[PDB]
Amino acid sequence: ETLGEKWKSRLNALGKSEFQIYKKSGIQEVDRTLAKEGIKRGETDHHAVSRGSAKLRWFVERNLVTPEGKVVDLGCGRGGWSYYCGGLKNVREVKGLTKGGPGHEEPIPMSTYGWNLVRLQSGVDVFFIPPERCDTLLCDIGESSPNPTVEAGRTLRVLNLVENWLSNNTQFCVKVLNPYMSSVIEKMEALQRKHGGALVRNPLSRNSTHEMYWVSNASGNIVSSVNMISRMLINRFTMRHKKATYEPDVDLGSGTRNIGI
Ligand SMILES: Nc1ncnc2c1ncn2[C@@H]1O[C@H](CSCC[C@H](N)C(=O)O)[C@@H](O)[C@H]1O
């Protein structure tokens, strides 16, 4: 049943080195060697806390998601999406939330452009806190699993979360870990019916995830766009040139922002 599931099993059948080779075959990457060595030293200016900033940049530079006003970042991790939104013109406030703790990503304090508008807190489980007013809602939650039914449940769980934070006309960028399972496809169709947007594949995503993002300023038939990605991921199982094309990492500048009137 379904292309994505067929893709999933071939993926699970892949050897430990076949998997790694496949994971990056023909994908788009961000050159992060030097930014990570800077962060390690302790630099807090210019650098991105993770490859997630570049990730979000791809969507924003194409108006698929136009962050503005108060931005809530569910599952901010180190703060990749949050610090990036902190430098955008129309952004007034950014609030990031994560689980944190031993063996989980924790926010890293930075001084990138507009950091003073960024509040990052860990020790928080977004699934059980009351929804807050939000102009733009970001969510990058979704732990992958060898079992597609497990991911299907994790995905429905975040889709039900973001729904209660979604008011009408809120800008959003929500990760949909497993968009191919039949039960997630159904929910996404409902969600889109009530809230526009569409699922879009980020070229920076690795081939090892069927990861798609529900973005507000986009359109397209759900089933149609998901199968399009399933075929793409299956095609990449057998590639002659599998070199990943790199791009310089994002520069988040430095300094406080003075929004004023
Ligand atoms: N219920 C929950 N509440 C809060 N954070 C959660 C959560 N479930 C998962 N997470 C967190 O969400 C994070 C998603 S990884 C995303 C990182 C971010 N987009 C980057 O660019 O900076 C994980 O680090 C994980 O610890």
Side-chain angles (χ1 to χ4, degrees), residues 1-88 90-261:
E1 224 106 338
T2 108
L3 272 188
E5 293 187 276
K6 177 165 148 132
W7 166 78
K8 189 65 173 185
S9 42
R10 305 204 183 168
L11 179 61
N12 284 327
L14 257 54
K16 190 173 175 182
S17 203
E18 287 183 294
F19 187 89
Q20 294 303 313
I21 284 174
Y22 172 68
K23 183 174 183 188
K24 300 196 171 186
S25 296
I27 75 177
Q28 224 174 288
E29 278 280 12
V30 172
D31 170 26
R32 286 249 299 149
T33 299
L34 296 191
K36 289 158 71 188
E37 287 309 293
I39 280 169
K40 182 179 308 174
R41 293 187 205 90
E43 288 165 49
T44 69
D45 296 275
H46 293 292
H47 310 295
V49 288
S50 66
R51 69 179 92 91
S53 291
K55 196 91 162 293
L56 214 200
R57 178 178 65 182
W58 193 84
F59 288 129
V60 174
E61 296 195 318
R62 290 169 180 68
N63 309 319
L64 292 164
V65 193
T66 305
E68 51 196 44
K70 184 159 82 97
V71 189
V72 170
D73 185 6
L74 273 27
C76 64
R78 298 167 200 142
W81 286 16
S82 293
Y83 283 118
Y84 173 69
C85 289
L88 298 186
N90 301 328
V91 173
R92 293 291 210 82
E93 172 192 349
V94 187
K95 186 203 282 192
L97 298 178
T98 36
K99 206 154 78 64
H104 284 96
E105 278 166 32
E106 296 219 56
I108 287 179
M110 296 292 272
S111 57
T112 50
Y113 192 53
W115 62 268
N116 63 114
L117 315 184
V118 187
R119 299 180 174 197
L120 260 35
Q121 45 180 294
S122 53
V124 177
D125 176 308
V126 303
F127 293 107
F128 299 82
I129 65 176
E132 296 178 35
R133 298 181 176 179
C134 47
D135 302 308
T136 156
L137 177 95
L138 309 174
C139 193
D140 209 351
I141 300 177
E143 170 180 34
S144 65
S145 162
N147 184 311
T149 55
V150 170
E151 298 180 311
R154 293 176 176 171
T155 301
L156 287 181
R157 205 189 171 200
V158 318
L159 286 184
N160 282 311
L161 192 206
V162 310
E163 191 171 10
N164 309 319
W165 291 72
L166 283 191
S167 64
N168 285 320
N169 181 19
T170 87
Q171 282 290 92
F172 59 81
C173 177
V174 181
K175 171 183 169 179
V176 184
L177 186 290
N178 196 311
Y180 57 88
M181 284 305 266
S182 26
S183 55
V184 171
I185 281 181
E186 226 206 52
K187 187 51 176 303
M188 265 311 300
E189 296 171 301
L191 277 189
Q192 181 185 231
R193 223 124 52 197
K194 201 137 177 182
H195 296 289
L199 296 178
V200 176
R201 178 71 174 183
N202 199 121
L204 291 171
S205 290
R206 281 55 183 295
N207 296 315
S208 56
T209 174
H210 203 305
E211 196 167 78
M212 316 222 326
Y213 289 82
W214 181 33
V215 293
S216 50
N217 321 329
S219 46
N221 183 287
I222 296 183
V223 163
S224 172
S225 65
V226 171
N227 275 312
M228 167 175 280
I229 301 306
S230 286
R231 277 169 241 133
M232 179 194 79
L233 291 168
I234 289 170
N235 293 335
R236 291 184 182 185
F237 272 122
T238 51
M239 285 196 268
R240 264 170 71 100
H241 310 312
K242 49 205 78 185
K243 203 182 299 294
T245 156
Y246 281 73
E247 74 174 11
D249 192 29
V250 182
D251 175 358
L252 305 170
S254 66
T256 55
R257 196 132 77 86
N258 228 293
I259 302 313
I261 313 170

